[PDB]
Amino acid sequence: EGCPTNGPKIPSIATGMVGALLLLLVVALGIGLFMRRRHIVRKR
Amino acid sequence: EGCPTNGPKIPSIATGMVGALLLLLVVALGIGLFMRRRHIVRKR
């Protein structure tokens, strides 16, 4: 209105939270599928 | 010197690349140690 008042805004650092979550899910999918596709043998 | 010239500088978005890599390594360590510590049984 007249003076600078902090409101509902997100900083730049937040970028790390988004990219982290996104990639996190991507990595999880890669590993899992890797175990499924890749065969497995019983070893003592 | 006189006019605005782009140089060797990094934007804010880069923050996502750093946090992603850092966390990525952290998560990898957690999972691994989890498998090592946690016992395992042979199941068909």
Amino acid at the residue B7: G
Q: How many beta carbons lie within 10 A of that of residue B8, not counting itself?
A: 4
Q: Is B23 on the interface with A (CB under 8 A)?
A: yes
Kindly give, in sequence order, each residue whose CB lies less than 8 Å from that of residue B23, ignoring residues fewer than 6 positions away: A20, A24
Q: Is B35 on the interface with A (CB under 8 A)?
A: no
Q: Which residue of A has its CA nearest to B28?
A: A27
Would you say domain B14-36 falls under CATH 1.20.5.420? yes
Nearest to B28 by CA among A21, A24, A17, A34: A24
CA A13/CA B15 separation, integer angstroms: 6
How determined? NMR
Q: Is B17 on the interface with A (CB under 8 A)?
A: yes
Q: Which residues of B touch A16 (CB under 8 A)?
A: 15-16, 18-20
CA A29/CA A43 separation, integer angstroms: 26
